[PDB]
């Protein structure tokens, strides 16, 4: 009836081999085109003749060694031409090769070796150290001059091919989640049939090149290696270091003129998303996973000749294929059978389990009779005594000789190289007391980006994510949670994906290390910005990206992290995880100053009330402003943050005033615009009496009925740069709460600033203990900052007077976006951060001006490592003394390395107050300050008001010379340039001088960007305006 069609008609795939091995095709090719390029790898390249000859000599060598059929030889070689020569030679000798990838765990490699028990292990010197070999077999090192010279004393002629096709050609292992890997013994004629089939499929003229990016640990490589060689094509082998980086791989695909390429949907998605240009004319081979219908829609547009491949390892590489979820018709000598539970064929359109039969079938599993007999079963639809392999995949016959994939029988979904069991996810997700039902499904918000979305039905918010993540791996937790009414259905009686709600698709770093890590995460995930509590695997992070991330971490921070530790700690905050946590402290008799505060209080107790450390927040408000709401807002935010209402009397102690006790005032003055500057210049220069007054004043200036200027004048004693964000967020919170006439939405503070002080003191109390962390770091600083120079020697216009006037000036300068990008690229290319690059440029700048070979410069740190200090408004800023050495006249590269070492060394000792170091050693330790800002400036964002916030200058100088550089990011996330300023002492410099310092600094940066290998002593330090006159003088002299 119709059973004849699904058995015989659609399986009319039978070709008798024309008495030609793929090897023999390769040899005939070598004879035909001797000078043709066969294999390219990195710099080196081999011809067909060279490849064939070396393979032959190695073949006769191994043959003399005692290697024959039914014997395995391990290939512990690096990805190179040598591995091609190796496996080819082994195929020539008649034996089988065991491909080893050395990146895999030592336990698994040792398992492969102990299980296979090969005769000998061939290897290179680059790898021979990695092998803790067993005494079961000897190890031949191909690099060894003795061995190498031994190879060349053997014929370079072809070998006889009188071997049986039933003998194994290679063995591939697979982990089928059983717990123990199985050795799939692939016979020769299967491989030959496959390779001949694929050779017939793709024309592959001499001009074609194939880029191999799959490891030899998988059968796919056999296609990527032997297929171009049986044709007249060339083969470009790529190292793992190239495969990990997309910008490198995409560069190779263009620079090597690659014509054809095979890969997994993951890699393809990694390329098409950000590097489409390289896949313009490329011939694409997809396989290994169900191709997303968006990804395919992208490939069929950008690329050409996109062929979808399918097959398990037990049927040798690929069994079915089809040009563009159709897995299409089978290949040569491959019968496909869609059967039911009674092993009977089903009519077209009916879903059944797939059984593959034919010449593709392997011998079975190495020394595993039971598993073989479990899956390699008897075949009733083939020749008498034949065998089927049950895939475990559910397939359905299409209308015309095609197969539609449905899904596996274990109800697992393969995504991003993971075997995800959705059932467990919905199980633990619905196990919640507040969750009744749930369904998880992978949807695509971005083209090719498959993300797990969870749709939930509640019982009769974000904590659910914490509930799911504390019981499941990070690659299983959904990227989006959507609550719905009921799961919709299609007329066919299936869940409608299209009728479901469209997915939403979605902290800050606390120390230098965390920011470096976040930068790395962002660079690897190819997304603009990441946070301290973002998960790596939820954002498309897979195993390969994990590998590259580990590499970049190992090179940027100098620490090797196991991938298991990365899975266990998928977020940066977990990665960095040591200082004791800050618990809440009981009411103390007195509260000691924080060490950051102690310094300021010392300067205040010595000099007196000064506007030096004032922090004036100026906000321009446009629109209708509710005054009472503003006043109540200020009162509220003061009531919340105790440091805003704290006095510091003499006894040195903190005295927190009650909300009603410290009466907060709001001054309201109406002035003309033409005076707004003047008044401000006065208002900012108010001098706080810290002994008896809370260091905060609020002054509203009325320019017009809708135009206002709000001034929040605070002191650095109670507020830092960080605190300016939770502060400005609370003021907006209260204001908008009074206008809407609703209760303010606040997040309760687990600890107060007093707790930070008490914790600080309690920690530093263990300075006596030699085994304490603080004693260790203090020892570190006692060694590194030992022998610091008394004072730097900058080209000052005026000699340093006795009494510091503390009057300061400011010079603003800008650095265009292009140069910004160039600096970033330099940084990333030389294992450093932009921070370190700017540091190097600055130190070189100072040394060039004659500040000496040894220059210590200070830089501030957030000093907020604890999570409880995240929203506290107070003074937490620490300061690291980066001691830089510019001696030896080094290149900017070498200097950058030095600065990198200094910074990385300093980061591991950041948990100690600068004040303590000042107390222990004898501005104290550095006269030059460098502040680097990466975060964007805070804003109020009040309701019904246009806000424009800026931090006004007081006109003072905290140091002799301070350089502040703020990095601005674009709308996309791309570099939009650098905004910098020089804060200089007015009594040591002129405005013109520092104005020249800016220009010289920028020019220096461009200079070292053009050539990073340039010695800093050869940097041009002259300005164009100076060069003109300079050349004019000599123009008048010599003529």
């Amino acid at each position: 009836e119709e059973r004849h069609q699904v058995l015989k008609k659609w399986n009319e795939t039978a070709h008798p081999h024309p008495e030609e091995n793929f090897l023999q095709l390769f040899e005939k090719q070598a004879e035909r085109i001797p000078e043709a390029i066969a294999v390219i790898c990195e710099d080196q390249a081999l011809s067909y003749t060279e490849l064939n000859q070396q393979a032959n000599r190695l073949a006769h060598f191994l043959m003399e060694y005692g290697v024959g059929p039914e014997q395995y030889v391990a290939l512990a070689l690096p990805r190179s031409a040598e591995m091609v020569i190796a496996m080819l030679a082994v195929l020539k000798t008649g034996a089988a090769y065991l491909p080893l990838d050395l990146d895999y765990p030592d336990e698994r490699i040792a398992f492969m070796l102990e299980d296979t028990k090969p005769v000998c292990i061939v290897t290179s010197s680059s790898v021979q150290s990695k092998l803790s070999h067993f005494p079961s077999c000897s190890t031949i090192i191909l690099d060894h001059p003795e061995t190498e010279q031994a190879i060349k004393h053997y014929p370079d002629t072809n070998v006889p091919k009188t071997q049986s096709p039933l003998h194994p050609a290679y063995v591939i292992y697979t982990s089928g989640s059983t717990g123990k890997p199985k050795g799939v013994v692939v016979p020769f004629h299967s491989l030959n049939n496959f390779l001949l089939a694929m050779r017939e499929k793709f024309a592959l003229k001499e001009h074609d090149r194939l880029l191999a990016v799959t490891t030899i640990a998988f059968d796919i490589s056999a296609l990527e290696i032997f297929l171009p060689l049986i044709s007249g094509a060339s083969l470009v082998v790529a190292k793992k270091e190239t495969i990990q980086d997309p910008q490198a791989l995409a560069a190779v695909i263009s620079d090597k003129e690659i014509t054809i390429m095979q890969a997994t949907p993951t890699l393809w998605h990694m390329l098409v998303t950000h590097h489409p240009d390289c896949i313009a004319g490329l011939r694409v081979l997809v396989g290994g996973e169900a191709l997303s219908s968006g990804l395919a829609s992208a490939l069929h547009r950008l690329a050409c000749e996109v062929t979808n491949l399918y097959g398990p390892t037990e049927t040798t590489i690929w069994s079915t294929m089809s040009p563009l979820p159709s897995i299409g018709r089978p290949i040569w000598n491959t019968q496909v059978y869609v059967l039911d539970e009674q092993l009977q064929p089903v009519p077209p359109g009916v879903v059944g389990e797939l059984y593959i039969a034919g010449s593709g079938l392997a011998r079975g599993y190495l020394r595993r009779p039971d598993l073989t007999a479990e899956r390699f079963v008897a075949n009733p639809y083939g020749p008498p005594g034949s065998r089927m392999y049950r895939t475990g995949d559910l397939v359905r016959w299409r209308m015309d000789g095609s197969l539609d994939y449905i899904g596996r029988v274990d109800h697992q979904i393969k995504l991003r190289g993971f075997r995800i069991e959705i059932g467990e996810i919905e199980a633990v997700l619905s196990q919640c007391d507040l969750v009744e039902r749930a369904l998880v499904v992978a949807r695509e918000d971005q083209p090719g980006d498959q993300r797990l979305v969870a749709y939930v039905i509640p019982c009769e918010l974000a904590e659910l994510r914490r509930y799911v993540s504390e019981r499941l791996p990070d690659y299983m937790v959904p990227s989006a949670f959507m609550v719905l009414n009921e799961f919709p259905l299609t007329p066919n009686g299936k869940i409608d994906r299209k009728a479901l709600p469209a997915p939403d698709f979605t902290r800050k770093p606390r120390n230098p290390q965390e920011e470096i890590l976040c930068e790395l995460f962002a660079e690897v995930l190819e997304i603009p910005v990441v946070g301290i509590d973002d998960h790596f695997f939820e954002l498309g992070g897979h195993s390969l990206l994990a590998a590259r991330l580990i590499s970049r971490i190992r090179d940027v921070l100098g620490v090797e992290i196991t991938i298991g530790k990365l899975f266990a700690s998928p977020t940066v905050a977990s990665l960095v995880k040591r200082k004791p946590p800050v618990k809440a402290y009981a009411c103390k008799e007195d509260i000691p100053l924080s060490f950051a505060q102690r310094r300021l209080w010392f300067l205040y107790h010595l000099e007196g009330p000064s506007p030096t450390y004032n922090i004036p927040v100026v906000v321009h408000l446009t629109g209708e402003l509710h005054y009472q709401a503003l006043q109540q807002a200020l009162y509220d935010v003061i009531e919340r943050h105790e440091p805003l209402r704290t006095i510091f009397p003499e006894h040195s102690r903190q005295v927190i005033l009650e909300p009603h006790q410290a009466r907060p005032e709001l001054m309201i003055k109406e002035i003309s615009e033409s005076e707004l500057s003047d008044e401000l210049n006065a208002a900012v220069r108010y001098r706080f009496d810290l002994a008896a007054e809370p260091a905060i004043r609020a002054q509203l200036f009325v320019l017009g009925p809708n135009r206002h200027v709000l001034l929040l004048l605070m002191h650095h004693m109670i507020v830092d740069g960080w605190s300016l964000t939770p502060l400005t967020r609370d003021i907006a919170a209260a204001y908008n709460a009074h206008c809407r006439n609703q209760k303010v939405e606040w997040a309760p503070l687990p600890v107060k600033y007093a707790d930070y002080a008490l914790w600080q003191q309690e920690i530093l109390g263990d300075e006596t203990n030699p085994d304490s962390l603080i004693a260790k770091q203090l020892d570190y600083w006692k060694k590194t900052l030992a022998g610091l120079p008394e004072e730097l020697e900058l080209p000052t216009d005026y000699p340093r007077p006795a009494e510091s006037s503390y009057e300061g000036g400011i010079v603003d300068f800008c650095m265009d976006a292009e140069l910004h990008k160039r600096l970033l690229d330099l940084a990333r290319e030389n294992k450093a951060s932009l921070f370190m690059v700017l540091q190097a440029g600055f130190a070189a700048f100072l040394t060039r001006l004659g500040a000496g070979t040894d220059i210590p410069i200070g830089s501030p740190i957030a000093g907020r490592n604890d999570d409880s200090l995240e929203h506290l408004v107070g003074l937490f800023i620490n300061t690291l003394v980066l001691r830089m050495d510019t001696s030896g006249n080094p290149s900017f590269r070498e200097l950058l390395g030095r600065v990198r070492e200094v910074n990385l060394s300093a980061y591991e000792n950041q948990d100690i107050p600068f004040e303590r170091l000042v107390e222990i050693l004898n501005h104290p330790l550095f006269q030059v300050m460098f502040v680097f800002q990466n975060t964007p400036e805070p804003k109020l964002e009040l309701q019904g008001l246009e806000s424009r916030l800026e931090i006004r200058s007081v006109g003072t100088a905290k140091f002799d010379l301070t350089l502040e550089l703020r990095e601005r990011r674009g709308e996309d996330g791309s570099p939009d340039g650098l905004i910098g300023l020089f804060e200089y002492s007015r009594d040591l410099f002129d405005h013109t001088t520092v104005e020249a310092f800016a220009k010289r600094l920028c020019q220096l940066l461009r200079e070292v960007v053009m050539n990073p290998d340039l010695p800093i002593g050869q940097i041009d330090m002259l300005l164009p305006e100076e060069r003109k006159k300079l050349l004019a003088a000599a123009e008048n002299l010599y003529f």
Binding site: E70, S164, L166, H167, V185, E341, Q342, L343, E353, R363, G364, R367, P369, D370, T372, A373, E374, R375, F376, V377, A378, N379, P380, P383, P384, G385, S386, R387, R390, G392, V409
Partner: protein, 64 residues
């Protein structure tokens, strides 16, 4: 469930001309070119038989 994956069921051990062993559900008719090596018994016992008899897994075409 799969015919072979069923644990609580009756099975068979079929042998090939090439000496290749194969598990088989007792209910389903035996294919041509396959003879019974181990009669109707528990799946575990069958797999034990296979483990105890199918020593050399290369076809008898190679054995000589």
């Amino acid at each position: 469930t799969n015919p072979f994956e069923n644990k609580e069921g009756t099975y068979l051990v079929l042998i090939n001309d090439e000496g290749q062993y194969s598990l088989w559900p007792a209910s389903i008719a035996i294919p041509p070119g396959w003879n019974i090596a181990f009669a109707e018994n528990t799946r575990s016992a069958c797999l034990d038989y296979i483990n105890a008899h199918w020593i050399d897994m290369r076809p008898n075409s190679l054995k000589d």
